[PDB]
Each structure stands twice: as structure tokens, then as C-alpha cells.
Design an enzyme around this catalytic site. Structure first.
Site, PDB file in Angstrom:
ATOM      1  N   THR A 221      -3.912   1.080  -4.537  1.00 22.12           N
ATOM      2  CA  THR A 221      -4.529   2.197  -5.228  1.00 22.12           C
ATOM      3  C   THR A 221      -4.108   2.169  -6.693  1.00 22.12           C
ATOM      4  O   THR A 221      -2.948   1.845  -6.997  1.00 22.12           O
ATOM      5  CB  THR A 221      -4.202   3.557  -4.541  1.00 22.12           C
ATOM      6  OG1 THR A 221      -5.112   4.570  -5.007  1.00 22.12           O
ATOM      7  CG2 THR A 221      -2.780   4.016  -4.746  1.00 22.12           C
TER       8      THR A 221
ATOM      9  N   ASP B 247      -0.693   2.245   8.079  1.00 21.07           N
ATOM     10  CA  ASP B 247      -1.695   1.481   7.366  1.00 21.07           C
ATOM     11  C   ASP B 247      -1.063   0.217   6.815  1.00 21.07           C
ATOM     12  O   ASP B 247      -0.519   0.198   5.712  1.00 21.07           O
ATOM     13  CB  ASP B 247      -2.434   2.282   6.304  1.00 21.07           C
ATOM     14  CG  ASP B 247      -3.705   1.581   5.844  1.00 21.07           C
ATOM     15  OD1 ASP B 247      -4.560   2.248   5.193  1.00 21.07           O
ATOM     16  OD2 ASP B 247      -3.829   0.365   6.098  1.00 21.07           O
TER      17      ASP B 247
ATOM     18  N   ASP C 174       0.814  -1.208   0.000  1.00 17.19           N
ATOM     19  CA  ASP C 174       0.000   0.000   0.000  1.00 17.19           C
ATOM     20  C   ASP C 174       0.852   1.263   0.000  1.00 17.19           C
ATOM     21  O   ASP C 174       0.446   2.284   0.572  1.00 17.19           O
ATOM     22  CB  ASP C 174      -1.007   0.029   1.160  1.00 17.19           C
ATOM     23  CG  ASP C 174      -2.284   0.818   0.839  1.00 17.19           C
ATOM     24  OD1 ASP C 174      -2.960   1.242   1.790  1.00 17.19           O
ATOM     25  OD2 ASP C 174      -2.593   1.008  -0.342  1.00 17.19           O
TER      26      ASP C 174
ATOM     27  N   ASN D 274       0.007   7.311   3.047  1.00 21.54           N
ATOM     28  CA  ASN D 274       0.362   6.382   4.100  1.00 21.54           C
ATOM     29  C   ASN D 274       1.685   6.692   4.764  1.00 21.54           C
ATOM     30  O   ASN D 274       2.141   5.922   5.617  1.00 21.54           O
ATOM     31  CB  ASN D 274       0.361   4.962   3.565  1.00 21.54           C
ATOM     32  CG  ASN D 274      -1.023   4.423   3.411  1.00 21.54           C
ATOM     33  OD1 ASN D 274      -1.990   5.019   3.902  1.00 21.54           O
ATOM     34  ND2 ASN D 274      -1.139   3.271   2.803  1.00 21.54           N
TER      35      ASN D 274
ATOM     36  N   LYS E 249       1.957   4.665  -0.924  1.00 26.27           N
ATOM     37  CA  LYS E 249       1.371   5.841  -1.546  1.00 26.27           C
ATOM     38  C   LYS E 249       1.594   7.003  -0.579  1.00 26.27           C
ATOM     39  O   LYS E 249       1.784   6.779   0.602  1.00 26.27           O
ATOM     40  CB  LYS E 249      -0.129   5.644  -1.856  1.00 26.27           C
ATOM     41  CG  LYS E 249      -0.966   5.304  -0.646  1.00 26.27           C
ATOM     42  CD  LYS E 249      -2.440   5.072  -1.016  1.00 26.27           C
ATOM     43  CE  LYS E 249      -3.315   4.800   0.206  1.00 26.27           C
ATOM     44  NZ  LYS E 249      -4.734   4.684  -0.182  1.00 26.27           N
TER      45      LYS E 249
HETATM   46  O1  LIG Z   1      -6.230  -0.303   5.178  1.00 24.56           O
HETATM   47  C1  LIG Z   1      -6.457  -0.997   3.946  1.00 24.56           C
HETATM   48  C2  LIG Z   1      -5.425  -0.377   2.965  1.00 24.56           C
HETATM   49  N1  LIG Z   1      -5.377   1.083   2.878  1.00 24.56           N
HETATM   50  C3  LIG Z   1      -6.461   1.737   2.158  1.00 24.56           C
HETATM   51  C4  LIG Z   1      -7.826   1.408   2.706  1.00 24.56           C
HETATM   52  O2  LIG Z   1      -8.181   0.045   2.506  1.00 24.56           O
HETATM   53  C5  LIG Z   1      -7.915  -0.866   3.572  1.00 24.56           C
END
Ligand SMILES: O[C@@H]1CNCCOC1
Ligand SMILES: O[C@@H]1CNCCOC1
EC number: 2.7.11.11
Length: 340
Positions: A191, A174, A156, A161, A158
Site C-alpha cells: 500500500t 493476509d 504487506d 492486516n 499495515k
Molecule cells: O492479498 C494481497 C495483499 N493484500 C492486499 C490485497 O492485495 C492482494
């Protein structure tokens, strides 16, 4: 690799595995905290600034609604997130301080980083200079070296985060898509702008997707917009898989060369995924000025310190409608979340 790095990573893995095998559980409860302000909200959870009523410490509390997690088929992801977070330890990862659950929700109580998201600063500043982008990039390189050595994929990366702390360093938040993976994994997640081609194409993919995402991040930091930008996801995906990227003329030659090797559509040729692993990145000319040890030790003066008034300041976060934290009289989804 220098035996010094090998021995560091061996100890890191030992310590991770001990916590991984025997996770902590149930280390606080909701009524130990006062709610202050909603900092973010999504389809199955929220992040709340809270204050511990006995110590006065502030924390970022992530609250996940068990029923919505189940409905949106995120059970395993939420269990991954907590089990991983309680087991890791690295300078650029936000720390999990407590976790618990109740009849309705799952809770992860993290350190609060008042500087806000890199995303906000990048959009306010427009773009970062190459030294500024490089300072953040080096922290991600080291963080991925750590995570990948533990068999963890992050999935994730990006700007939203990456929180900027009181010393101007990054803290990754996250872990909702992070997973312990020896070999390949298959879930479609991330994303659109940051997805590697092999994710888009529904392949079994590996840690090389994180190195792709680093290429996207570095491009976006240095340009002010991501490389595969388009108006709808379908058009973004077409650009990602094409093997073509255009660079602003202000990019240095070294930056362009690094990015061509990170944004390599053939995962078997992508930097971070070759025989020399992370060292192809750490030894690249774009990183020639980077003192990797000094970055790890947080001895480098950062590009900027976010403006904030103290550990309870929420100015660098956005305003959201304030909704209840309701806890049902009846336990929901107990079986699914037994291990949490
Ligand atoms: O926390 C997970 C990954 N981050 C974006 C939102 O979707 C769920
Ligand atoms: O268990 C499979 C893969 N893991 C996440 C999505 O749920 C289905």
C-alpha cells in the site's frame, strides 16, 4: 544472540522447511461449511465467515477467483501465500486450518479472529499511547524475526492486516504478498503509505522493506496518521523518498530516535538491516520496558480486549453486498494452480 534464541530459530526453520518441501493440499471441501457473512472483498477475492457443519467451528475463508488471479497476474503471489501459510507456526500469525480448490476458486480456511482489524480500533480511538503501540510493535518485531529467519519477506504490513484477538494480541493476516527470498526481489507491491523508498524506486530490495514498514506502522499507531500522508500516491511517494519526516511534539524522544532509524531512506543504514540485525531494535531505549519472552509467551496483559459476544460475532467487521460463491461446471486455470 543468546544460544537460546539461536536454537529456537534453528528449530523453527527445520519445522518450516519440512512443511515447505511437502505442502499440504486438499484438506477440506466447500460443502463442509455454511456461509455466514462476507467480511471483506477485493479485486480477485473475498473473505467469508463460515461455520463447519460437523464441528460447529467458525473460520475466515479466503476465496480467490482463479480467472481473476490470472487476469491480474497474481498467480505466483497466490501460490506463495498458501505455501507459506501452510508451513509457518508462530503465536502472532493467523493459522491456516484447511485449503482446497475447485473448478473456479482457491480457498484458504483460516482461524476467525472476531476482534476485528487494528485499523478500525485505531481510527475509533484516534491514536494509541506509546505503551499500547509498543505492545503491538513488539509482537511485529518478534514476528519479523521469525519470518526473516525463514527467508520470508512479509511485504504487506499495515493496520488492516493486524487482527486483534480474544486476549488483545495481534494476529497477522493476509500473506498475499509474502515471499520466500534469499537475497533480493523486485515486484512492486504494497500500500502506498507503507512502501519503502527502494520499492518506489524499482530496485531489487530485501527484508529491510519490512523494517521500514514497521517504522510507518509505529508512527501511525502513535500519531493516528501515517508519516508520509498526502492526497494522491504520487505526492506520497515524493515524501517517502525525500529523507524528511516530521514528528508530533507529543512523541517521546526515544520514539523519535527509533523512528529515524527505521524510516532510514538508506537501506544499508536502516535498523533491522545492520550487522546486529533485529537486536538493534530490541535493545533500543524505546523498548526498554518490553519483556520480549513474556510477550512471546502471551503472559503480558494486553492494552484492551475488543468487545465481541462470541466466536461468531461479526460486529467488528463491516457490511458488504452478499454475492454467490459460484463454481463453474468446467475446470478453470487448472494448469496454473496445479500446486495449490
Ligand atoms: O492479498 C494481497 C495483499 N493484500 C492486499 C490485497 O492485495 C492482494
Ligand atoms: O514472475 C515475475 C515476478 N513475480 C511476480 C510478478 O510476476 C512476474
Amino acid at each position: 544472540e543468546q544460544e537460546s534464541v539461536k536454537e529456537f530459530l534453528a528449530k523453527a526453520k527445520e519445522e518450516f522447511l519440512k512443511k515447505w518441501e511437502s505442502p499440504s493440499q486438499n484438506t477440506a471441501q466447500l460443502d463442509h461449511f455454511d456461509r455466514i457473512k462476507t467480511l471483506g472483498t477485493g479485486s480477485f477475492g473475498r473473505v467469508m465467515l463460515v461455520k463447519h457443519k460437523e464441528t460447529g467451528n467458525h473460520y475466515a475463508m479466503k476465496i480467490l477467483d482463479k480467472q481473476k488471479v490470472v487476469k491480474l497476474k497474481q498467480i505466483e503471489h497466490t501460490l506463495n501465500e498458501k505455501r507459506i501459510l501452510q508451513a509457518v507456526n508462530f503465536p502472532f500469525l493467523v493459522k491456516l486450518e484447511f485449503s482446497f480448490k475447485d473448478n473456479s476458486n482457491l480457498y484458504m480456511v483460516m482461524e476467525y479472529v472476531p476482534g476485528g482489524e487494528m485499523f478500525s480500533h485505531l481510527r475509533r480511538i484516534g491514536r494509541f499511547s506509546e505503551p499500547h503501540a509498543r505492545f503491538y510493535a513488539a509482537q511485529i518485531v518478534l514476528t519479523f524475526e521469525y519470518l526473516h529467519s525463514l527467508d520470508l519477506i512479509y511485504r504487506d504490513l499495515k493496520p488492516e492486516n493486524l487482527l486483534i484477538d480474544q486476549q488483545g494480541y495481534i494476529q497477522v493476516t493476509d500473506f498475499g504478498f509474502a515471499k520466500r527470498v534469499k537475497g533480493r526481489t523486485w515486484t512492486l507491491c504494497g500500500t502506498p503509505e507503507y512502501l519503502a523508498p527502494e520499492i518506489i524506486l524499482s530496485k531489487g530490495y530485501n527484508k529491510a522493506v519490512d523494517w521500514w514498514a514497521l517504522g510507518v506502522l509505529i508512527y501511525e499507531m502513535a500519531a493516528g496518521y501515517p508519516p508520509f500522508f498526502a492526497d494522491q500516491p504520487i505526492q506520497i511517494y515524493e515524501k517517502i523518498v525525500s529523507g524528511k519526516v516530521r514528528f508530533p511534539s507529543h512523541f517521546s524522544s526515544d520514539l523519535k530516535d527509533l523512528l529515524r532509524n527505521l524510516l532510514q531512506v538508506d537501506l544499508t543504514k536502516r535498523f533491522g538491516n545492520l550487522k546486529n540485525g533485529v537486536n538493534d531494535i530490541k535493545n533500543h531505549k524505546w523498548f526498554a520496558t518490553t519483556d520480549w519472552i513474556a510477550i512471546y509467551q502471551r503472559k503480558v496483559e494486553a492494552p484492551f480486549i475488543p468487545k465481541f459476544k462470541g466466536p461468531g460475532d461479526t460486529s467488528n467487521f463491516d457490511d458488504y453486498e452478499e454475492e454467490e460463491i459460484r463454481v463453474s461446471i468446467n475446470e478453470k486455470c487448472g494448469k496454473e494452480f496445479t500446486e495449490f
